[PDB]
Design a binder for this molecule. Structure first.
Ligand SMILES: CCOc1cccc(C(=O)Nc2nnn(C)n2)c1
Length: 152
């Protein structure tokens, strides 16, 4: 059948919101009130992959855009990018591995591990207005925990 998708927003555990802030750029900042329309709406697709009760493979597309979060090596490091795709072919159930995150539910928060790069996570910085990135530990000063808000 089709792939199933939900519209949502994400906020880091410090309650920073995610925004598009440059051609292919995702940054995190403290947002409230009028400025909250600026936040990125995701289409979270439930994709093929290894699954358990608390670990669910997803893709993260930007709502009604042919753009996906993806994990690739750049200058020899696992990095997070926004990657364009052929809009005729996406989303699909069998997303390529660079697009797949393991959505992990621990203590009422979510972590998004790269399926391609084990123990690399979607991360934010403590500082305002810095890139969303792929970080190689769910420990330390960088933030790896999120909450999801369901959108109409
Ligand atoms: C040397 C700059 O490298 C880049 C290039 C492009 C964007 C970014 C960024 O700020 N955030 C980002 N990029 N993709 N995702 C997803 N999140 C960083």
């Amino acid at each position: 059948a089709p792939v199933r998708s939900l519209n949502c927003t994400l906020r880091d555990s410090q309650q920073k919101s995610l925004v598009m802030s440059g051609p292919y750029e995702l940054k995190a900042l403290h947002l409230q009130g009028q400025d909250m329309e600026q936040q990125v709406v995701f289409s979270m697709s439930f994709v093929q992959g290894e699954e358990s009760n608390d670990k669910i493979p997803v893709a993260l597309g930007l709502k009604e855009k042919n753009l996906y979060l993806s994990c690739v090596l750049k200058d020899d490091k696992p990095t997070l990018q926004l990657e364009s795709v052929d809009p005729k072919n996406y989303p699909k159930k069998k997303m390529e591995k660079r697009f797949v995150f393991n959505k992990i539910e621990i203590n009422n928060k979510l972590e998004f591990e790269s399926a391609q790069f084990p123990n690399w996570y979607i991360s934010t910085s403590q500082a305002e207005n810095m890139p969303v990135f792929l970080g190689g530990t769910k420990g330390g000063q960088d933030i790896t925990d999120f909450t999801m808000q369901f959108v109409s």
